[PDB]
Structure formats: C-alpha cells, structure tokens
Design a protein around this ligand. Structure first.
Ligand SMILES: Cc1cn([C@H]2C[C@H](OP(=O)(O)O)[C@@H](COP(=O)(O)O)O2)c(=O)[nH]c1=O
Ligand SMILES: [Ca+2]
Length: 135
C-alpha cells in the first residue's frame, strides 16, 4: 500500500470525515471498521456513537499530518465515499478506535482487507479488556 497526504476539512462522526484529497474535497469512510451511528434515524444514536465521534474528532483535529492509504481493491463505495486506512501523525485511526473498543471490525470485503488481521488482533485485546463496546 502507499500513504498519501490529505488535509482535514471536517470531522463528521467516528468513521466518516471530509478531507481535501488531490486538490478536491470528498468524504472518506474508514476501511474494515464500524463506529456506532449518531445520524441515521433507522439506527438512531447507538451506544458509544458519541464517544467514537469525539475520539476520532480529537485525533484528527490535533494531528500535524493526515495520510490516506487506499487498499488494493475499489477506492470508493456506492455513496462515492473514499475507502481508506487513515493515519494521524503516523497512527492508524482505524486501529486506534478498534483498540479502545469504540468500533467493531466490519465490512470486510476482499480484496480490501490487507490490514484485517492486524485490526482483528486489536479488537480481541479490546474485548479481553472488556473495553467500551465490549464492557
Ligand atoms: C467500510 C465500508 C462501508 N461500505 C458500505 C456498507 C454499508 O452500506 P448500506 O448503508 O447500504 O448498508 C455502509 C456502512 O457505512 P456506515 O457505517 O457509514 O453506515 O457503507 C462499503 O460499501 N464498503 C466498505 O468498505
Ligand atoms: Ca458507522
């Protein structure tokens, strides 16, 4: 994979944000994870939804550098959102959330699963530590 610079435009929730990428603004959705909903009426405000949003917001707003790393398959989803692993000062936001029990590993669609095992190992640790979503 290969990291590329991006500039934060606006944090939306735990797993979705707006970034300036290659000159253009677009919304990104974190690969392989799912933070709880705080927007869609069908799901309502789910437990830890507000917590995941705050964690992500803090993490991306305070970073000196943001980088996007597309996987080997499709780079956007059906809603036109970029699908990537996002790094804040070298730290993967996707992993950070999973490690804290603020996201579950989900939407594993091959071949966009390069970091699946890494994320799963962090999810298991969060589970055994009974963190947030796993408490
Ligand atoms: C992370 C991810 C989400 N999605 C889709 C699946 C879900 O579609 P449906 O909404 O049609 O079920 C939605 C989940 O994202 P949200 O967690 O942002 O809702 O985005 C992908 O298509 N591929 C991905 O890699
Ligand atoms: Ca979500």
């Amino acid at each position: 994979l290969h990291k590329e610079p991006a500039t934060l435009i606006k944090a939306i929730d735990g797993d979705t944000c707006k970034l300036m990428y290659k000159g253009q603004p677009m919304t990104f959705r974190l690969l392989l994870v799912d933070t709880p909903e705080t927007k869609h009426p069908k799901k309502g405000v789910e437990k830890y939804g507000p917590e995941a949003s705050a964690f992500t917001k803090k993490m991306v707003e305070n970073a000196k550098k943001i980088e996007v790393e597309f996987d080997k398959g499709q780079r956007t989803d059906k809603y036109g959102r970029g699908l990537a692993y996002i790094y804040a000062d070298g730290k993967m936001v996707n992993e950070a959330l999973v490690r804290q029990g603020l996201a579950k590993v989900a939407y594993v669609y091959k071949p966009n699963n390069t970091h699946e095992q890494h994320l799963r190992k962090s999810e298991a640790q969060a589970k055994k530590e009974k963190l947030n979503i796993w408490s």
